[PDB]
Coordinates of C-alpha atoms and ligand atoms in Angstrom, one line a residue:
Chain A
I6 CA 9.2 95.4 121.3
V7 CA 12.6 96.8 120.1
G8 CA 14.9 97.9 122.9
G9 CA 12.8 96.5 125.7
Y10 CA 13.4 94.0 128.4
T11 CA 12.0 90.7 129.6
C12 CA 8.9 91.6 131.7
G13 CA 9.0 88.5 133.8
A14 CA 6.5 85.7 133.9
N15 CA 3.1 87.0 134.7
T16 CA 4.1 90.5 135.7
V17 CA 1.7 92.0 133.1
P18 CA -1.4 89.8 133.9
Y19 CA -3.8 91.7 131.7
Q20 CA -1.8 91.1 128.5
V21 CA -3.4 88.5 126.2
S22 CA -2.2 86.8 123.0
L23 CA -4.6 86.6 120.0
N24 CA -4.0 83.3 118.3
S25 CA -5.3 81.7 115.0
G26 CA -2.8 78.8 114.9
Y27 CA 0.0 81.2 115.8
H28 CA 0.2 84.5 117.7
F29 CA -0.8 87.4 115.4
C30 CA -1.7 90.3 117.7
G31 CA -1.9 91.2 121.4
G32 CA -4.7 92.6 123.5
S33 CA -5.8 93.6 127.0
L34 CA -8.2 92.0 129.3
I35 CA -10.7 94.7 130.6
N36 CA -12.9 92.3 132.6
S37 CA -13.4 88.5 132.9
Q38 CA -15.1 88.3 129.5
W39 CA -13.9 91.2 127.3
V40 CA -10.7 91.9 125.6
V41 CA -9.7 95.2 123.9
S42 CA -7.4 95.0 120.8
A43 CA -6.8 96.9 117.5
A44 CA -9.3 96.9 114.7
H45 CA -6.8 95.9 112.1
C46 CA -6.2 92.7 114.1
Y47 CA -9.8 91.6 113.3
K48 CA -10.1 87.9 112.3
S49 CA -12.6 85.1 112.2
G50 CA -12.1 82.3 114.7
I51 CA -9.7 83.8 117.3
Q52 CA -8.5 81.9 120.3
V53 CA -7.6 84.2 123.2
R54 CA -4.7 83.1 125.3
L55 CA -4.4 84.4 128.9
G56 CA -1.8 83.9 131.6
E57 CA 0.8 83.5 128.9
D58 CA 4.5 84.2 129.0
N59 CA 6.3 81.8 126.6
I60 CA 4.0 81.8 123.6
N61 CA 5.8 78.8 122.2
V62 CA 5.6 76.4 125.1
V63 CA 2.3 75.5 126.8
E64 CA 3.1 75.4 130.5
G65 CA -0.3 74.3 131.6
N66 CA -1.0 77.4 133.7
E67 CA -2.6 79.4 130.8
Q68 CA -6.2 79.7 129.8
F69 CA -7.2 79.3 126.1
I70 CA -10.7 80.6 125.4
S71 CA -12.4 81.1 122.0
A72 CA -13.8 84.5 121.0
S73 CA -17.5 84.4 120.6
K74 CA -17.7 87.9 119.0
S75 CA -15.3 90.6 117.7
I76 CA -16.9 94.1 117.5
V77 CA -14.8 96.5 115.5
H78 CA -15.3 100.2 116.0
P79 CA -18.1 101.3 113.5
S80 CA -16.0 104.2 112.3
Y81 CA -12.7 102.3 111.8
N82 CA -11.1 103.6 108.6
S83 CA -8.6 101.1 107.2
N84 CA -7.0 103.9 105.1
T85 CA -6.5 106.4 107.9
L86 CA -6.3 104.0 110.8
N87 CA -8.6 106.3 112.7
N88 CA -10.7 104.5 115.4
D89 CA -8.4 101.5 115.3
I90 CA -10.1 99.7 118.2
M91 CA -12.0 96.4 118.5
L92 CA -13.7 94.6 121.4
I93 CA -13.6 90.8 121.7
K94 CA -16.1 88.8 123.8
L95 CA -14.9 85.5 125.2
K96 CA -17.1 82.4 124.8
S97 CA -16.7 81.9 128.5
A98 CA -15.4 84.1 131.3
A99 CA -11.7 84.0 132.2
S100 CA -10.8 82.7 135.6
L101 CA -9.1 85.7 137.2
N102 CA -6.1 84.8 139.4
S103 CA -2.5 85.7 140.1
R104 CA -1.7 85.2 136.4
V105 CA -4.9 86.6 134.8
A106 CA -6.1 90.0 135.8
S107 CA -8.0 92.9 134.2
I108 CA -6.6 96.4 133.6
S109 CA -8.6 99.5 134.4
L110 CA -10.0 101.8 131.7
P111 CA -9.1 105.5 132.1
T112 CA -11.4 108.3 133.3
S113 CA -8.9 111.0 132.4
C114 CA -6.5 111.0 129.5
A115 CA -2.7 111.0 130.1
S116 CA -0.6 114.1 129.4
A117 CA 2.6 114.4 127.4
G118 CA 5.6 113.2 129.3
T119 CA 3.8 110.5 131.2
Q120 CA 5.8 107.3 131.3
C121 CA 3.8 104.2 130.3
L122 CA 4.5 100.5 130.1
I123 CA 4.1 98.9 126.6
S124 CA 4.2 95.1 126.2
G125 CA 4.1 92.4 123.5
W126 CA 5.7 89.4 121.7
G127 CA 6.5 91.4 118.5
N128 CA 9.8 91.6 116.6
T129 CA 12.8 92.7 118.7
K130 CA 14.9 94.0 115.8
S131 CA 14.3 97.4 114.1
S132 CA 16.3 95.8 111.3
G133 CA 15.6 92.3 110.2
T134 CA 13.5 89.9 112.3
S135 CA 13.8 88.2 115.7
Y136 CA 10.6 87.2 117.5
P137 CA 10.8 86.4 121.3
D138 CA 9.4 83.4 123.2
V139 CA 8.7 85.5 126.3
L140 CA 6.8 88.7 126.8
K141 CA 8.9 91.9 126.4
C142 CA 8.3 95.2 128.1
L143 CA 9.3 98.8 127.3
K144 CA 9.0 102.0 129.3
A145 CA 8.2 105.0 127.1
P146 CA 6.8 108.5 127.5
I147 CA 3.8 110.0 125.7
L148 CA 5.0 112.6 123.1
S149 CA 3.5 116.1 122.6
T150 CA 0.9 116.3 119.8
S151 CA 3.2 118.8 118.0
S152 CA 6.1 116.3 118.0
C153 CA 3.7 113.6 116.9
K154 CA 2.2 115.7 114.1
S155 CA 5.6 116.8 112.8
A156 CA 6.8 113.2 112.7
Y157 CA 3.8 112.1 110.7
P158 CA 2.5 115.2 108.8
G159 CA -1.2 114.8 107.9
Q160 CA -1.5 111.4 109.5
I161 CA -2.3 112.0 113.2
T162 CA -6.0 112.4 114.2
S163 CA -7.4 113.4 117.6
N164 CA -7.8 109.7 118.4
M165 CA -4.1 109.0 118.2
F166 CA -1.0 109.7 120.3
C167 CA 2.7 109.1 119.8
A168 CA 4.8 107.4 122.5
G169 CA 8.4 106.5 122.5
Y170 CA 11.7 108.2 121.6
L171 CA 12.5 110.4 118.6
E172 CA 16.1 109.3 118.7
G173 CA 14.8 105.8 117.9
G174 CA 16.2 102.6 119.3
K175 CA 13.1 101.8 121.4
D176 CA 9.7 101.1 120.0
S177 CA 6.9 98.6 119.6
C178 CA 7.0 96.5 116.4
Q179 CA 5.2 93.9 114.2
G180 CA 3.5 91.4 116.4
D181 CA 2.7 94.0 119.1
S182 CA -0.5 95.4 117.6
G183 CA -3.5 95.5 119.9
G184 CA -1.3 95.4 122.9
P185 CA -1.6 97.6 126.0
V186 CA 0.0 101.0 126.8
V187 CA -0.6 101.3 130.5
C188 CA 0.2 104.5 132.4
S189 CA -0.3 104.7 136.1
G190 CA -2.4 101.5 136.3
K191 CA -4.7 102.7 133.5
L192 CA -5.1 101.5 129.9
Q193 CA -4.3 104.6 127.8
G194 CA -3.3 103.2 124.5
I195 CA -3.4 100.3 122.0
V196 CA -0.4 99.5 119.7
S197 CA -1.4 100.4 116.2
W198 CA 1.2 101.6 113.6
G199 CA 4.4 103.5 112.7
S200 CA 7.0 103.9 110.0
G201 CA 9.2 100.9 110.5
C202 CA 10.2 100.2 114.0
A203 CA 12.5 102.1 116.4
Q204 CA 13.4 104.5 113.5
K205 CA 14.8 107.9 114.4
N206 CA 12.0 110.5 114.3
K207 CA 9.4 107.8 113.6
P208 CA 7.9 106.9 117.0
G209 CA 5.0 104.6 117.6
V210 CA 1.4 105.7 117.1
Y211 CA -1.2 104.4 119.5
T212 CA -5.0 104.5 119.7
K213 CA -6.1 107.1 122.3
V214 CA -8.3 104.9 124.6
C215 CA -9.6 107.7 126.8
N216 CA -11.7 108.9 123.8
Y217 CA -13.5 105.5 123.6
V218 CA -14.5 104.6 127.1
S219 CA -18.2 105.4 126.6
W220 CA -18.3 103.3 123.4
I221 CA -16.6 100.5 125.2
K222 CA -19.1 100.6 128.1
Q223 CA -22.1 100.9 125.8
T224 CA -20.9 98.0 123.7
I225 CA -20.1 95.7 126.6
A226 CA -23.4 96.4 128.2
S227 CA -25.3 95.9 125.0
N228 CA -23.6 92.6 124.1
Chain B
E21 CA 1.5 93.5 87.6
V22 CA 0.5 92.8 91.2
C23 CA 2.7 89.6 91.2
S24 CA 5.9 91.5 90.6
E25 CA 5.7 93.8 93.6
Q26 CA 7.9 92.9 96.6
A27 CA 6.1 91.6 99.8
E28 CA 5.1 94.6 101.9
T29 CA 4.5 94.5 105.6
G30 CA 2.8 97.9 105.8
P31 CA 2.9 100.4 108.8
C32 CA 0.5 98.4 111.0
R33 CA 2.0 96.2 113.7
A34 CA 0.2 92.8 113.6
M35 CA 2.0 89.7 112.2
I36 CA -0.6 88.1 110.0
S37 CA 0.6 85.2 107.8
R38 CA -0.1 86.0 104.1
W39 CA 1.2 85.0 100.7
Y40 CA 2.9 86.7 97.9
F41 CA 4.2 85.5 94.6
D42 CA 8.0 85.3 94.5
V43 CA 9.2 85.8 90.9
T44 CA 12.7 84.5 91.6
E45 CA 11.5 81.1 93.0
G46 CA 8.5 81.2 90.6
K47 CA 6.0 80.3 93.3
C48 CA 4.1 81.7 96.2
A49 CA 5.8 82.1 99.5
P50 CA 4.5 83.3 102.9
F51 CA 5.3 86.5 104.7
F52 CA 4.1 88.4 107.8
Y53 CA 1.7 91.3 107.0
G54 CA 1.2 94.1 109.4
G55 CA -2.5 94.3 108.9
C56 CA -3.0 97.5 106.8
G57 CA -1.6 99.1 103.7
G58 CA 1.0 97.2 101.6
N59 CA 0.3 96.2 98.0
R60 CA -1.7 93.8 95.9
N61 CA 0.8 90.9 96.0
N62 CA -0.9 89.8 99.3
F63 CA -3.1 86.7 99.4
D64 CA -4.9 84.8 102.1
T65 CA -3.8 81.4 101.1
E66 CA -1.1 79.8 98.9
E67 CA -3.8 78.4 96.7
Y68 CA -5.4 81.8 96.0
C69 CA -2.0 83.3 95.3
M70 CA -1.3 80.5 92.8
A71 CA -4.8 80.9 91.1
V72 CA -3.9 84.5 90.5
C73 CA -0.1 84.5 90.0
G74 CA 1.0 81.0 89.4
Chain C
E3 CA 8.2 103.0 92.0
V4 CA 11.3 101.2 90.6
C5 CA 12.5 100.4 94.2
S6 CA 9.4 98.3 95.0
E7 CA 9.7 95.8 92.1
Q8 CA 11.2 92.4 92.9
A9 CA 14.7 91.5 91.6
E10 CA 14.4 90.1 88.1
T11 CA 17.0 87.9 86.5
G12 CA 15.5 88.2 83.0
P13 CA 15.6 85.6 80.2
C14 CA 19.3 85.9 79.4
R15 CA 21.8 83.4 80.8
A16 CA 24.7 85.3 82.3
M17 CA 25.2 85.7 86.0
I18 CA 26.1 89.4 86.5
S19 CA 26.2 90.7 90.0
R20 CA 23.8 93.6 90.4
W21 CA 21.9 95.4 93.2
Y22 CA 18.2 96.0 93.9
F23 CA 16.5 97.7 96.8
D24 CA 14.9 95.3 99.2
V25 CA 11.9 97.0 100.9
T26 CA 11.7 94.4 103.7
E27 CA 15.3 94.8 104.8
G28 CA 15.1 98.5 103.8
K29 CA 18.5 98.4 102.0
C30 CA 20.1 97.4 98.8
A31 CA 21.0 93.7 98.4
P32 CA 22.8 92.0 95.6
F33 CA 21.4 89.5 93.0
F34 CA 22.5 87.8 89.8
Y35 CA 21.1 89.4 86.7
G36 CA 20.9 87.4 83.4
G37 CA 22.1 90.3 81.3
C38 CA 19.0 91.4 79.5
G39 CA 15.4 92.5 80.3
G40 CA 14.3 92.5 83.9
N41 CA 13.1 95.8 85.5
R42 CA 14.4 99.2 86.9
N43 CA 15.3 98.0 90.4
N44 CA 18.7 96.9 89.0
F45 CA 21.8 98.9 89.8
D46 CA 25.5 98.5 89.1
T47 CA 26.7 99.2 92.6
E48 CA 25.3 99.2 96.1
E49 CA 26.1 102.9 96.3
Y50 CA 24.1 103.8 93.2
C51 CA 21.2 101.8 94.4
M52 CA 21.3 103.6 97.7
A53 CA 21.6 107.0 96.0
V54 CA 18.4 106.3 94.2
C55 CA 16.4 104.1 96.6
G56 CA 17.9 104.5 100.0
Chain D
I19 CA 23.6 73.3 83.0
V20 CA 20.4 71.6 84.4
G21 CA 20.3 67.9 84.0
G22 CA 23.8 67.6 82.7
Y23 CA 26.9 65.7 83.9
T24 CA 30.4 66.4 85.0
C25 CA 32.4 66.8 81.7
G26 CA 35.7 65.7 83.2
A27 CA 38.8 67.9 83.7
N28 CA 39.9 69.5 80.5
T29 CA 37.7 67.4 78.2
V30 CA 36.2 70.5 76.6
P31 CA 39.6 72.4 76.0
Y32 CA 38.0 75.3 74.0
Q33 CA 35.7 76.3 76.9
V34 CA 36.7 79.5 78.6
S35 CA 35.4 81.4 81.7
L36 CA 34.8 85.1 81.5
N37 CA 35.8 86.7 84.9
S38 CA 35.5 90.1 86.5
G39 CA 36.2 89.1 90.0
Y40 CA 33.9 86.1 89.6
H41 CA 32.8 84.0 86.7
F42 CA 29.9 85.7 84.9
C43 CA 29.7 84.2 81.4
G44 CA 31.4 81.5 79.3
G45 CA 32.9 81.6 75.9
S46 CA 34.8 79.6 73.2
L47 CA 38.4 79.9 72.1
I48 CA 38.4 80.1 68.3
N49 CA 42.2 80.6 68.0
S50 CA 45.1 81.5 70.2
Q51 CA 44.0 85.1 70.6
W52 CA 40.2 85.3 70.0
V53 CA 37.3 84.2 72.0
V54 CA 33.6 84.1 70.9
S55 CA 30.9 84.9 73.5
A56 CA 27.4 86.4 73.7
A57 CA 26.8 90.2 73.2
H58 CA 24.9 90.5 76.5
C59 CA 28.0 89.3 78.3
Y60 CA 29.8 92.5 77.3
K61 CA 31.8 94.1 80.1
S62 CA 34.8 96.4 80.7
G63 CA 37.9 94.8 82.1
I64 CA 37.3 91.1 81.4
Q65 CA 39.9 88.5 82.5
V66 CA 39.6 85.3 80.3
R67 CA 40.4 82.1 82.1
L68 CA 41.5 79.1 80.0
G69 CA 42.3 75.5 80.9
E70 CA 39.8 75.8 83.7
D71 CA 37.8 73.0 85.4
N72 CA 37.1 74.0 89.0
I73 CA 36.4 77.8 88.8
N74 CA 36.8 78.1 92.5
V75 CA 40.2 76.6 93.0
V76 CA 43.3 77.8 91.1
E77 CA 45.1 74.6 90.3
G78 CA 48.1 76.4 88.7
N79 CA 47.5 74.8 85.3
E80 CA 45.2 77.5 84.0
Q81 CA 46.0 80.6 81.9
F82 CA 44.6 83.9 83.0
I83 CA 44.8 86.5 80.2
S84 CA 43.1 90.0 80.1
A85 CA 40.9 91.0 77.2
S86 CA 42.4 93.8 75.1
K87 CA 39.2 94.5 73.2
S88 CA 35.6 93.2 73.1
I89 CA 33.8 93.7 69.8
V90 CA 30.0 93.3 70.0
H91 CA 28.1 92.6 66.8
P92 CA 27.1 96.0 65.3
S93 CA 23.5 94.9 64.9
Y94 CA 23.0 93.4 68.4
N95 CA 19.5 94.4 69.6
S96 CA 19.2 94.2 73.4
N97 CA 15.5 94.1 73.1
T98 CA 15.2 91.3 70.6
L99 CA 18.4 89.5 71.4
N100 CA 19.1 89.3 67.7
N101 CA 22.8 89.1 66.7
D102 CA 23.7 88.2 70.3
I103 CA 27.4 87.6 69.5
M104 CA 30.6 89.3 70.6
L105 CA 34.3 88.8 69.9
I106 CA 37.0 89.2 72.5
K107 CA 40.7 89.8 71.7
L108 CA 43.2 88.5 74.3
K109 CA 46.0 90.9 75.3
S110 CA 48.4 88.0 74.6
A111 CA 48.0 84.8 72.7
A112 CA 47.0 81.7 74.7
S113 CA 49.5 78.9 74.9
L114 CA 47.6 76.0 73.2
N115 CA 48.2 72.6 74.9
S116 CA 46.4 69.5 76.1
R117 CA 44.2 71.7 78.3
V118 CA 43.8 74.7 76.0
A119 CA 42.6 74.2 72.4
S120 CA 40.6 76.1 69.8
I121 CA 37.2 74.9 68.4
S122 CA 36.5 75.0 64.6
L123 CA 34.0 77.4 63.1
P124 CA 31.3 75.9 60.9
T125 CA 31.2 76.0 57.1
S126 CA 27.7 74.5 57.0
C127 CA 24.9 74.9 59.4
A128 CA 23.6 72.0 61.4
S129 CA 20.2 70.5 60.8
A130 CA 17.4 69.8 63.2
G131 CA 18.0 66.5 65.1
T132 CA 21.7 66.9 65.3
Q133 CA 23.1 66.1 68.7
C134 CA 25.4 68.8 70.1
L135 CA 27.5 69.2 73.3
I136 CA 26.7 72.2 75.5
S137 CA 28.9 73.2 78.4
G138 CA 29.2 75.8 81.2
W139 CA 29.4 76.5 85.0
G140 CA 25.8 77.9 85.3
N141 CA 23.0 77.0 87.7
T142 CA 22.2 73.3 87.9
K143 CA 18.7 73.7 89.3
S144 CA 15.7 74.6 87.2
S145 CA 14.2 75.7 90.5
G146 CA 16.3 77.6 93.0
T147 CA 20.0 77.9 92.7
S148 CA 23.1 75.6 92.8
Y149 CA 26.2 76.7 91.0
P150 CA 28.9 74.0 90.4
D151 CA 32.6 74.1 91.0
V152 CA 33.4 72.0 87.9
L153 CA 32.4 72.2 84.3
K154 CA 29.1 70.5 83.4
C155 CA 28.1 69.1 80.0
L156 CA 24.8 68.3 78.3
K157 CA 24.0 66.5 75.1
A158 CA 21.0 68.0 73.4
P159 CA 19.6 67.9 69.8
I160 CA 18.8 71.0 67.7
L161 CA 15.0 71.5 67.4
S162 CA 13.1 72.2 64.2
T163 CA 12.4 75.9 63.6
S164 CA 8.6 75.2 63.8
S165 CA 9.0 73.7 67.3
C166 CA 11.2 76.7 68.2
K167 CA 8.8 79.3 66.8
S168 CA 5.8 77.7 68.6
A169 CA 7.6 77.6 71.9
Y170 CA 8.5 81.3 71.5
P171 CA 5.9 83.0 69.3
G172 CA 7.2 86.1 67.7
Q173 CA 10.6 85.8 69.5
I174 CA 12.7 83.7 67.1
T175 CA 14.7 85.3 64.3
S176 CA 16.7 83.7 61.5
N177 CA 19.8 84.0 63.7
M178 CA 18.5 81.8 66.4
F179 CA 17.9 78.1 66.9
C180 CA 16.4 76.1 69.8
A181 CA 18.2 73.1 71.3
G182 CA 17.2 70.8 74.1
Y183 CA 14.0 69.0 75.2
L184 CA 10.4 70.2 75.1
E185 CA 9.7 67.9 78.0
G186 CA 12.1 69.9 80.0
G187 CA 14.5 68.6 82.7
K188 CA 17.6 69.3 80.7
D189 CA 18.8 72.8 79.6
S190 CA 21.5 75.4 79.9
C191 CA 20.9 78.1 82.6
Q192 CA 22.1 81.4 84.2
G193 CA 25.9 81.3 84.2
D194 CA 26.1 79.5 80.9
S195 CA 25.7 82.5 78.5
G196 CA 28.3 82.8 75.9
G197 CA 29.2 79.2 76.1
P198 CA 29.7 76.7 73.2
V199 CA 27.2 74.5 71.5
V200 CA 29.4 72.2 69.5
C201 CA 28.0 69.7 67.0
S202 CA 30.4 67.2 65.2
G203 CA 33.5 69.1 66.2
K204 CA 32.1 72.4 65.0
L205 CA 30.9 75.5 66.9
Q206 CA 27.3 75.9 65.9
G207 CA 25.8 77.9 68.8
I208 CA 26.3 80.3 71.7
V209 CA 24.2 80.1 74.9
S210 CA 21.9 83.1 74.9
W211 CA 18.4 83.0 76.6
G212 CA 15.2 81.1 77.4
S213 CA 12.2 81.3 79.6
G214 CA 13.5 80.0 83.0
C215 CA 15.6 76.9 82.7
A216 CA 14.7 73.3 81.9
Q217 CA 11.0 74.3 81.8
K218 CA 8.6 72.1 79.8
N219 CA 8.1 73.6 76.3
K220 CA 10.6 76.3 76.9
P221 CA 13.9 75.0 75.4
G222 CA 17.1 77.0 75.2
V223 CA 17.6 79.6 72.5
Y224 CA 21.1 79.9 70.9
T225 CA 22.8 82.2 68.5
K226 CA 23.1 80.6 65.1
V227 CA 26.9 80.8 64.6
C228 CA 27.0 79.6 61.0
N229 CA 25.3 82.9 59.9
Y230 CA 28.2 84.9 61.4
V231 CA 31.4 83.2 60.1
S232 CA 32.2 86.0 57.6
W233 CA 31.7 88.7 60.2
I234 CA 34.0 86.8 62.5
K235 CA 36.7 86.4 59.9
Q236 CA 36.4 90.0 58.8
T237 CA 36.6 91.3 62.3
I238 CA 39.5 89.0 63.4
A239 CA 41.5 90.0 60.3
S240 CA 40.8 93.7 60.8
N241 CA 41.7 93.8 64.5
Ligands
CA26 CA1 3.2 79.3 127.5
CA27 CA1 40.7 75.9 88.7

């Protein structure tokens, strides 16, 4: 997260860290046994870390659970980044508490101008690298489809939305992928891609979650 | 050749540890790949990189 | 493109300060060129490099 | 120089440093007003530094003289590296003393097996970089043409010779170009190129000076 702020230990209880020896992507806990993340974060042998704040220090209040199965969206296109969504089933159900909680899926999409909370442990520099120990947060509004399309001509599909600032300075970044974009207590987006990070006129592009709620429900119920 | 291209992160926002062949040092070095795009100087392990570029 | 090739010293043994465009940092950086060979991501000044690759 | 040793202040009095704000190539003083170097070291506005040991500290006993003219060999081929020789005329004649002396040009070429002294301020690592403050020296024998040709198939011309060790570990390197290869008090070579530095079966390739003595004399007399 570039231009964000320290969230505060456990203030974003649905935020999870995907780990394969090191943190590589984020994700959101949708219930005690399912995590939503990005398709391009797909990997074999993923350990999901919940109740996490400092990803570099084990405080003993976290929950480390292995993924039993990672279901990528059947129409994910690695070239277009369309349908960049994946579901991960935990080997065992997380113990929900003050530090571990699920986030609600949307019934309605969010409109342009809505302020959302984005979080992750990604790079904090739009130039160079600087990875944080603790979870960073960023408040950013959803951009209008026209603004989005103009910033990324030919690249935006109906399953994507742009969020952030066209002036740059504030954006999600490498290490944030799969993370939550929550607006009004609802999960509306998943960090996906963008040109660089925090670049003027190159805002972040996120997976439009409201378009996948049925798939999510069908998959969870069938697995 | 694939081994002469610079290490490319790509537009995706993950931080996946990958390997690329560094012509200056003459060996494979690790880098963080975003998860999509980039180029062919991008290998899973140092060993694979060396088998192809070393 | 010329701007994606890694900085190449070449087989000659001089140490001439040149510039190449570093895709990771997104800007031109200096390197020591041997004096012969190498590739096209090799400019006289940082300004020239930026005019072509920036 | 990889695998060499500290020559000792002013023990190689004919060795010069070519400078354009920083040392970029070496050279040899053939008389009080002429310096021999490599063609690929050609540059506009060269300052020749004589009586030099630590190129990073001005001790006050050196002589800094600007080049008035740099004459590259008319048949230098940047692609083949054939005729990689250049003559530099000093704006004013060097003051020859205990620290500044000329080296003799050869009348006869040297044979394979001859031990020669190579010097320069180039990289001291065959892997990575490490540039010295003081002048480094290396004793290396001239290799047989067959050994040379086999190490560099199709690359060796009649104006080049290989010197060094096929086992690797000792070689000239980046920053040494234009420098002297002196055998029995005679200038027999000029540092030119090679595959990497100190690599097994990739010895250094040098310009065969004995083939250019006439040109050198003709040029000096005509300029
Ligand atoms: Ca922790
Ligand atoms: Ca000095």
